[PDB]
Design a protein around this ligand. Structure first.
Ligand SMILES: COc1cc(C[C@@H]2C(=O)OC[C@H]2Cc2ccc3c(c2)OCO3)cc(OC)c1OC
Ligand SMILES: [Fe+3]
Length: 313
C-alpha cells in the first residue's frame, strides 16, 4: 500500500544550522520533488488550539448564507461557496493581519466574537511560521538563499475551511473536484476524518489517514522552481458515512511569481513567464479558465518549452 513520505516537523527539529534541520530539509526537498506533498508531524499548534480552530470553522460555516456572502464574491480566495447536499466553505483572508481578522470577525458578528478572532489569528500566525521555515529549506536546497527574503516580502496568508456533509453511505463518495492548488504551500489538517487524495506522477492514488497534517506544493512554488518541484493533483473522496471539516493554510506571493534565471538551463528551459496570482486564481474559477485548474501549462504564462524529461539528447 502506497503512502506519502512522513516527515517530522516538530519544532525541536527546526533549529537552523543543526543536524536535524539539514536532514529534514533533505527530506522535504525529496518529497516535494517526487510526490509534491507529504504527511507532516507539526507541533507548532497545540492539540487544544487545533480543535478550537475546528470549532471556529463550524461556527463560521453555521452562519446564514447572506452573512457569509458579506465576505465577497471571490470564491477563488476567501468567498463562500457551496454545492447542494455536498460541501460548503469559505476563508478568512489575510489571516496574519490582525486588523483584517478583527474586521472580518466584526463583519460576521457585529456584536463581536473575541474568541473567534483570537483563535484563528493565533493559528494562522503559527502555521505561517511553519510555512516560512519550509520555504526557507526549499530555497536552501536549490542554493537560492540570496533570493529568499525578497520572495517572502508581504506574503499573503489564507485560512480556509471546507465542510462536507455526511455522504449517507459507506464506500467511496466523491466530495471535492480534482485540482492543483495555486498557493506556494498548503498545510492541511483533516480534523480526524480522511478524504484528501493525491495522484502520483505514475497515476497511482494515495489517500492518507488523518494521523498527521498534510503539506502540499502549489503551482506558485512549482513555477518558481521551473518545474523542478511537483505540484500534485488532489481531490477529496469520503470513505466513511461521516461529515468532514478541513482546516487549510495557504501562502500566496505578494503579487508576481517569476522563475529565477539560475533554475533555467539547457536541460530545463523556462516553462513559465511571470504571472500575477490574483489574475490566475480568478481565471481558474471561470468557465473558460477551467482548463488551468489542473494544469498551469494551460495558462497564458506557459512558454511552450519542453519539460526536463523531454530534453532531446
Ligand atoms: C485553482 O483551482 C482550484 C483551486 C482550489 C483551491 C484554492 C486555491 O488554489 O487557493 C485557495 C483555495 C480556495 C478554495 C479552497 C477550497 C475550495 C474552493 C476554493 O472552492 C470550493 O472548494 C479549489 C478548487 O476547487 C475545489 C479549484 O478548482 C476550481
Ligand atoms: Fe486543494
Amino acid at each position: 500500500p502506497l503512502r506519502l513520505p512522513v516527515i517530522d516537523l516538530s519544532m525541536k527539529n527546526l533549529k537552523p544550522g543543526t543536524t536535524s534541520w539539514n536532514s529534514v530539509r533533505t527530506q522535504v526537498r525529496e518529497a516535494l520533488e517526487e510526490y509534491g506533498c507529504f504527511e507532516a508531524v507539526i507541533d507548532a499548534v497545540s492539540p487544544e488550539l487545533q480543535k478550537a480552530v475546528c470549532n471556529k470553522g463550524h461556527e463560521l460555516l453555521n452562519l446564514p448564507l447572506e452573512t457569509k456572502m458579506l465576505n465577497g464574491n471571490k470564491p477563488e480566495y476567501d468567498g463562500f461557496t457551496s454545492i447542494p447536499n455536498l460541501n460548503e466553505g469559505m476563508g478568512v483572508g489575510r489571516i496574519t493581519d490582525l486588523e483584517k481578522v478583527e474586521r472580518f470577525t466584526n463583519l460576521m458578528w457585529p456584536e463581536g466574537n473575541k474568541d473567534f478572532c483570537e483563535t484563528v489569528y493565533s493559528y494562522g500566525k503559527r502555521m505561517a511560521e511553519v510555512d516560512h521555515i519550509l520555504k526557507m529549506m526549499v530555497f536552501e536546497s536549490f542554493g537560492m538563499e540570496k533570493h529568499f527574503d525578497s520572495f517572502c516580502e508581504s506574503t499573503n496568508y489564507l485560512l480556509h475551511f471546507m465542510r462536507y456533509q455526511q455522504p449517507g453511505k459507506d464506500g467511496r463518495s466523491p466530495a471535492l473536484s480534482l485540482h492543483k492548488d495555486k498557493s506556494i504551500l498548503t498545510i492541511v489538517n483533516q480534523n480526524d476524518v480522511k478524504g484528501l487524495e493525491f495522484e502520483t506522477k505514475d497515476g497511482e492514488w494515495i489517500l492518507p489517514t488523518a494521523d498527521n497534517h498534510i503539506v502540499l506544493l502549489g503551482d506558485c512554488f512549482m513555477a518558481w522552481s521551473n518545474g523542478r518541484l511537483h505540484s500534485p493533483l488532489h481531490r477529496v473522496t469520503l470513505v466513511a458515512n461521516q461529515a468532514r471539516l478541513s482546516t487549510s493554510s495557504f501562502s500566496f506571493p505578494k503579487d508576481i511569481i517569476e522563475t529565477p534565471a539560475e533554475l533555467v538551463d539547457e536541460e530545463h528551459p523556462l516553462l513559465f513567464n511571470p504571472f500575477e496570482i490574483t489574475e490566475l486564481l480568478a481565471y481558474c474559477f471561470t468557465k473558460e479558465g477551467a482548463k488551468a485548474v489542473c494544469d498551469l501549462k494551460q495558462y497564458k504564462a506557459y512558454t511552450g518549452a519542453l519539460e526536463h524529461h523531454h530534453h532531446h539528447h
